[PDB]
């Protein structure tokens, strides 16, 4: 049948090195690949635990290509396990990267490409702008991401940041809803739209400027649901300038239609990134 051509990779061409991570996304390995882009190169490989969903995912991953979507190279389906092959993002998921650079961080981090310790305001803004740029692309295709959160973004060489997992853990509530990232219309009416992604992106913005804290971390899942549906908003992070907090708050309008577009949000973030406001205290 007709569909997107998905690149296939021979199995003897993939040499698994070791596991990088486990979780809701499956098992991810570091691997060498021959011959992807002409000689040998590191990639990330997702090995699937347990068939039909895989091909659909591979098709969609093939379609969704952007500077701020993690590069997908193709699949290996000759024998088990099924493999999906990605560019290797050397700094891992954005939530852990943020935490390792937070003030609270227990150890020093890096990396010859990024300084250890807290990120600059300009860098935090560059991280936010890049995730937004990714979201602009997806909204342009009417792709709705139902689990936008820093745990699903990846950080590569020199602080390039990309959306890393599409969602096709205490951050979830029993399906599993990333309830702390969800807008009122999702919780109340089970509606999720591109405007709902603007809300979630507002929460991502908060994650970034708290160096990866969990939204409403003091509260239970039902208590957080109470906050979200009663109109209580996450407080301004100490490292977050008032200009950036105004952007978050624009994302958190109760009425979806009064939230600013992701295009507008990205534009304001990128402007700040190019000229970061002075901010202390
Ligand atoms: F946005 C996420 C969050 C978590 C996992 C992924 C996985 C599943 C889909 C693709 N992917 C990738 C793709 C490339 C890559 N380079 C390094 C890593 C990685 C992953 C976990 C821990 C350390 N490193 N990854 N991970 C994406």
Swiss-Prot record:
Cellular localization per UniProt: Cell membrane; Early endosome membrane; Late endosome membrane; Recycling endosome membrane
Effect of residue 202 to S: In CIPA; processed as wild-type but shows significantly diminished autophosphorylation in both neuronal and non-neuronal cells
Tissues expressed in: Isoform TrkA-I is found in most non-neuronal tissues. Isoform TrkA-II is primarily expressed in neuronal cells. TrkA-III is specifically expressed by pluripotent neural stem and neural crest progenitors.
Residues annotated as the enzyme's active site: 147
Modified sites of kind Phosphotyrosine: 172-173, 279
Phenotype upon changing residue 268 to P: In CIPA; loss of function
Effect of residue 151 to C: In CIPA; processed as wild-type but shows significantly diminished autophosphorylation in both neuronal and non-neuronal cells
Regulation: induction: Isoform TrkA-III is up-regulated upon hypoxia in cells normally expressing it.
Effect of residue 26 to E: In CIPA; no effect on N-glycosylation, nor on subcellular location; reduced basal autophosphorylation and complete loss of NGF-induced autophosphorylation; loss of NGF-stimulated calcium flux
Sequence positions that bind ATP: 20-28, 46
Highest taxon in the source lineage: Eukaryota
Topology Cytoplasmic: residue spans: 6-281
Result after altering residue 46 to A: No effect on interaction with GGA3
Motif window: DXXLL: 39-43, 104-108
Post-translational modification (record): Ligand-mediated autophosphorylation. Interaction with SQSTM1 is phosphotyrosine-dependent. N-glycosylated. Isoform TrkA-I and isoform TrkA-II are N-glycosylated.
Interaction with PLCG1, annotated site positions: 279
Phenotype for residue 21 to E: In CIPA; following transfection in neuroblastoma cells and NGF treatment, small decrease in the percentage of cells differentiated into neuronal phenotype, but in differentiated cells, the average neurite length is comparable to wild-type; no effect on N-glycosylation, subcellular location, nor on basal and NGF-induced autophosphorylation; loss of NGF-stimulated calcium flux
Residue intervals of the Protein kinase domain: 14-269
Annotated domain remarks: The transmembrane domain mediates interaction with KIDINS220.
Clinical condition linked: Congenital insensitivity to pain with anhidrosis: Characterized by a congenital insensitivity to pain, anhidrosis (absence of sweating), absence of reaction to noxious stimuli, self-mutilating behavior, and intellectual disability. This rare autosomal recessive disorder is also known as congenital sensory neuropathy with anhidrosis or hereditary sensory and autonomic neuropathy type IV or familial dysautonomia type II.
Free-text function comment from the UniProt entry: Receptor tyrosine kinase involved in the development and the maturation of the central and peripheral nervous systems through regulation of proliferation, differentiation and survival of sympathetic and nervous neurons. High affinity receptor for NGF which is its primary ligand. Can also bind and be activated by NTF3/neurotrophin-3. However, NTF3 only supports axonal extension through NTRK1 but has no effect on neuron survival. Upon dimeric NGF ligand-binding, undergoes homodimerization, autophosphorylation and activation.
Quaternary structure and interacting proteins, as annotated: Exists in a dynamic equilibrium between monomeric (low affinity) and dimeric (high affinity) structures. Homodimerization is induced by binding of a NGF dimer. Interacts with SQSTM1; bridges NTRK1 to NGFR. Forms a ternary complex with NGFR and KIDINS220; this complex is affected by the expression levels of KIDINS220 and an increase in KIDINS220 expression leads to a decreased association of NGFR and NTRK1. Interacts with SH2D1A; regulates NTRK1. Interacts (phosphorylated upon activation by NGF) with SHC1; mediates SHC1 phosphorylation and activation.
Family stated for the protein in its record: Belongs to the protein kinase superfamily. Tyr protein kinase family. Insulin receptor subfamily.
Further comment found in the protein's record: Trk also stands for tropomyosin-related kinase since it was first isolated as an oncogenic protein which was the result of a fusion between the tropomyosin gene TPM3 and NTRK1.
Protein name per UniProt: High affinity nerve growth factor receptor
Gene designation: NTRK1
Residues of the full protein shown: 502 to 793 of 796
């Amino acid at each position: 049948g007709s569909g997107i051509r998905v690149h296939h990779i021979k199995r003897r061409d993939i040499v698994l090195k070791w596991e990088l991570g486990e979780g809701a996304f499956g098992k991810v390995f570091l691997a060498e690949c021959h011959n992807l882009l002409p000689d040998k190169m590191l990639v990330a490989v997702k090995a699937l635990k347990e068939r039909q969903d895989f091909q659909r995912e591979a098709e969609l991953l093939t379609m969704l290509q952007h500077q701020h979507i993690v590069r997908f190279f193709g699949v290996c389906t000759e024998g088990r396990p099924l493999l999906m092959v990605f560019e290797y993002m050397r700094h891992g998921d954005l939530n852990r990267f943020l935490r390792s650079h937070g003030p609270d961080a227990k150890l020093l981090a890096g990396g010859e490409d990024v300084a250890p310790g807290p990120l600059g305001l300009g860098q935090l803004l560059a991280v936010a702008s890049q995730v937004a740029a990714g979201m602009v692309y997806l909204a342009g295709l009417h792709f709705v991401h139902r689990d936008l959160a820093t745990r699903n973004c990846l950080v590569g060489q020199g602080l390039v940041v990309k959306i890393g997992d599409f969602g096709m853990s205490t951050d979830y509530y029993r399906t599993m809803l990333p309830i702390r990232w969800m807008p009122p219309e999702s919780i109340l009416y089970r509606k999720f739209t591109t405007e709902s992604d603007v809300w979630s992106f507002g929460v991502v913005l908060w994650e970034i400027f708290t160096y990866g804290k969990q939204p409403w971390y003091q509260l239970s899942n039902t208590e957080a649901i109470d906050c979200i549906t009663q109109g209580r908003e996450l407080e301004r992070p100490r490292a977050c300038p008032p200009e950036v907090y105004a952007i978050m708050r624009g994302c958190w309008q109760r009425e979806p239609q009064q939230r600013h577009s992701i295009k507008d949000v990205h534009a304001r973030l990128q402007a700040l990134a190019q000229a970061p406001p002075v901010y202390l205290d």
